[PDB]
Design an enzyme around this catalytic site. Structure first.
Site, short mmCIF file in Angstrom:
data_model
loop_
_atom_site.label_atom_id
_atom_site.label_comp_id
_atom_site.label_asym_id
_atom_site.label_seq_id
_atom_site.Cartn_x
_atom_site.Cartn_y
_atom_site.Cartn_z
N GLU A 34 -11.21 29.43 27.64
CA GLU A 34 -12.01 30.30 26.79
C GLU A 34 -13.48 30.05 27.14
OE1 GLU A 34 -11.54 29.44 22.46
OE2 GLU A 34 -10.41 31.29 22.21
N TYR A 52 -21.61 32.46 13.11
CA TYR A 52 -21.51 31.54 11.99
C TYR A 52 -22.75 31.51 11.06
CZ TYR A 52 -17.33 30.07 14.44
OH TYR A 52 -16.13 30.05 15.09
N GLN A 63 -17.34 39.23 18.07
CA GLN A 63 -15.92 39.37 18.28
C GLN A 63 -15.61 40.24 19.47
OE1 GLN A 63 -14.76 36.45 15.97
NE2 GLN A 63 -13.45 37.65 17.35
N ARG A 94 -6.00 31.08 24.58
CA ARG A 94 -5.95 32.23 23.66
C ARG A 94 -5.70 33.50 24.45
NH1 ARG A 94 -10.02 29.57 19.98
NH2 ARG A 94 -8.73 28.69 18.28
N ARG A 154 -11.16 17.41 13.56
CA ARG A 154 -11.43 17.53 14.99
C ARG A 154 -12.65 18.34 15.34
NH1 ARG A 154 -5.73 15.83 16.27
NH2 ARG A 154 -4.81 17.88 16.73
N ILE A 155 -13.14 19.15 14.40
CA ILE A 155 -14.39 19.88 14.60
C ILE A 155 -15.52 18.86 14.51
CG2 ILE A 155 -16.02 21.46 13.53
CD1 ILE A 155 -13.71 23.24 12.83
N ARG A 158 -15.29 16.49 17.86
CA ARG A 158 -15.82 17.18 19.02
C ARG A 158 -17.35 17.34 18.91
NH1 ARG A 158 -18.61 19.32 22.12
NH2 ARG A 158 -18.18 21.09 23.49
N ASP A 207 -1.88 11.54 17.40
CA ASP A 207 -2.78 11.26 18.49
C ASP A 207 -2.21 11.73 19.84
OD1 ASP A 207 -5.05 9.00 19.69
OD2 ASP A 207 -5.37 9.93 17.69
N1 ADP Z 1 -3.73 15.49 19.65
C1 ADP Z 1 -4.96 14.94 19.48
N2 ADP Z 1 -5.15 13.70 19.00
C2 ADP Z 1 -6.38 13.16 18.83
N3 ADP Z 1 -7.52 13.81 19.12
C3 ADP Z 1 -7.48 15.08 19.61
C4 ADP Z 1 -6.17 15.72 19.81
N4 ADP Z 1 -6.37 16.94 20.28
C5 ADP Z 1 -7.72 17.09 20.35
N5 ADP Z 1 -8.38 15.97 19.97
C6 ADP Z 1 -9.85 15.83 19.91
O1 ADP Z 1 -10.26 16.83 18.97
C7 ADP Z 1 -11.45 17.52 19.38
C8 ADP Z 1 -11.23 19.02 19.53
O2 ADP Z 1 -10.32 19.22 20.61
P1 ADP Z 1 -10.47 20.43 21.67
O3 ADP Z 1 -9.40 20.21 22.73
O4 ADP Z 1 -11.91 20.55 22.10
O5 ADP Z 1 -10.04 21.68 20.72
P2 ADP Z 1 -9.87 23.26 21.03
O6 ADP Z 1 -9.95 23.38 22.53
O7 ADP Z 1 -8.52 23.64 20.45
O8 ADP Z 1 -11.01 23.90 20.26
C9 ADP Z 1 -11.87 16.85 20.67
O9 ADP Z 1 -12.77 15.84 20.21
C10 ADP Z 1 -10.61 16.15 21.18
O10 ADP Z 1 -10.95 14.93 21.82
C1 LLT Z 2 -11.16 34.29 21.04
C2 LLT Z 2 -11.98 34.12 19.80
C3 LLT Z 2 -12.46 32.86 19.44
N1 LLT Z 2 -13.18 32.71 18.32
C4 LLT Z 2 -13.67 31.38 17.99
C5 LLT Z 2 -15.11 31.18 18.47
C6 LLT Z 2 -15.19 29.68 18.73
O1 LLT Z 2 -15.62 28.99 17.55
C7 LLT Z 2 -13.76 29.24 19.01
C8 LLT Z 2 -13.56 28.85 20.47
O2 LLT Z 2 -12.43 27.94 20.58
O3 LLT Z 2 -12.93 30.36 18.69
C9 LLT Z 2 -13.45 33.78 17.55
O4 LLT Z 2 -14.19 33.63 16.43
N2 LLT Z 2 -13.02 35.02 17.88
C10 LLT Z 2 -12.28 35.19 18.99
O5 LLT Z 2 -11.83 36.43 19.33
#
Ligand code: ADP
Ligand code: LLT
Ligand code: ADP
Ligand code: LLT
Lengths: 226, 226
Positions: A34, A52, A63, A94, A154-155, A158, A207
């Site tokens: 993405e 946001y 969007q 996605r 996790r938000i 990260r 984890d």
């Molecule tokens: N299964 C898991 N266990 C522990 N930490 C995780 C796991 N999956 C993700 N994280 C941590 O959570 C945060 C968000 O993960 P990320 O892969 O960036 O999410 P996404 O790509 O779905 O938005 C990152 O800090 C990542 O290191």
């Molecule tokens: C694909 C998509 C992602 N998102 C959000 C925008 C980002 O916060 C996060 C990226 O992982 O997803 C949207 O709000 N609309 C979308 O259509």
């Protein structure tokens, strides 16, 4: 001839973390991430922030930009002469479906998009779809399933600035629409085939460190059946 | 094999009036009108009204919708199996170029669109262009030239509700950008070929009733050279 698989899940469920694991499992697997980094600097303005910062003002703009930049990146992976390998698999982060049926649909329902905005969004979505739909059709879906509460933590881990204000409520709504679509398979789309597409649900609340090895076998097993 | 000609001019210069005259001149000539009627009811909301009601809020949404609905209608005329006739000519009402280089550019410069909006608009425009650009390339342009003051009177005569609030100032800005592009040929585009494309300028300040016969000969003469 390329198998296309999409990776679906709530914000911060661990999609990018999961995706970084895939290329090392087999040389034939490609990934289309993405373009989130690109969304916070357009070509610049940070339109992800504006989304946001004022969803009533910027949802429609964001969007539709989010979904277009996803289409282009996905189309570019198909043309991208990685057809030549034995049994090629392309993972999408996605898809056009969640972009519309989950994210855009949710903001319209929250009154962040008005009827006119929602109508134009859909009409553009459909048109994008019949132009470049057949080439993007999915053979399978992987649902990284995690509680809204886990995602909220996790938000924080990260630490992506623009997303630090996201409340639990927002994530809860996204969660139920994912579950309706991917678990109960009760969500109605305009795309017949989606209702028969195979779906692997992986629980990612624990984890990633001690679930890795099992998640991998589940993925390898799932791909064989396709 | 289809010659494509665009009809350019300010708001209410007489483009639709001119266009209604063309099919009767030769059986081989087709016309792609600007979907203005469709813009005031989307598929509904009147997004043309919202544009003029609050340009700072709606310019980006409208401008991008205007241009997409123009692309689709134009592409549909090309596919539209009217290739079979002897020497086929397809007149476009405005084009992707004015949509961008005149209308959208003007609102950005009036601060009705911010940098982010303008950047996304352009980026989408380019992408639309390389996907379906070659098929839409113009062989010629017809500039219906009229004073902003004449246009202002014609907005009144026509009586299209959404446009009744348009001030002279707005029309003056559109006028100078048309003149820069089509008369002085000083406007820089991203499209090299546009600078060599033949242009017929017709002065449409007088009544259409006693200029008709001369305008027609000018059009017939112009097409021969192409
Ligand atoms: N299964 C898991 N266990 C522990 N930490 C995780 C796991 N999956 C993700 N994280 C941590 O959570 C945060 C968000 O993960 P990320 O892969 O960036 O999410 P996404 O790509 O779905 O938005 C990152 O800090 C990542 O290191
Ligand atoms: C694909 C998509 C992602 N998102 C959000 C925008 C980002 O916060 C996060 C990226 O992982 O997803 C949207 O709000 N609309 C979308 O259509
Ligand atoms: N050359 C002309 N002389 C007199 N009236 C005109 C002339 N051209 C257009 N009109 C009138 O002006 C109004 C606007 O014209 P129209 O063709 O709808 O403009 P456009 O299609 O460029 O927006 C209409 O009422 C039309 O009858
Ligand atoms: C093609 C186009 C037309 N217009 C306006 C919108 C209508 O007022 C009128 C239709 O003739 O032209 C724009 O504001 N932007 C545009 O891109």
């Amino acid at each position: 001839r390329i198998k296309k698989i999409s990776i679906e899940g709530n914000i911060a469920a661990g999609k990018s973390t999961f995706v970084n694991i895939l290329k090392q499992l087999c040389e034939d697997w490609e990934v289309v991430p993405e373009p989130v980094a690109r969304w916070c600097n357009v070509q610049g303005g940070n339109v992800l922030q504006m989304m946001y910062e004022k969803p009533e003002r910027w949802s429609f703009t964001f969007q539709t930009y989010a979904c277009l930049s996803m289409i282009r990146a996905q189309l570019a992976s198909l043309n991208g002469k990685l057809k030549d390998a034995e049994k090629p698999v392309l993972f999408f982060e996605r898809s056009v479906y969640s972009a519309r049926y989950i994210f855009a649909s949710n903001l319209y329902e929250s009154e962040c998009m008005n009827e006119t905005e929602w109508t134009i969004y859909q009409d553009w979505h459909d048109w994008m779809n019949n132009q470049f739909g057949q080439s993007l059709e999915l053979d399978g879906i992987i649902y990284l399933q995690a509680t809204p509460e886990t995602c909220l933590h996790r938000i924080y881990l990260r630490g992506r600035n623009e997303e630090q204000g996201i409340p639990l409520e927002y994530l809860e709504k996204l969660h139920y629409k994912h579950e309706s679509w991917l678990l109960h398979r009760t969500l109605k789309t305009n795309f017949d085939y989606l209702q028969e597409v195979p779906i692997l649900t992986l629980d990612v609340n624990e984890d990633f460190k001690d679930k890795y090895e099992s998640l991998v076998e589940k993925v390898k097993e799932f791909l064989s059946t396709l």
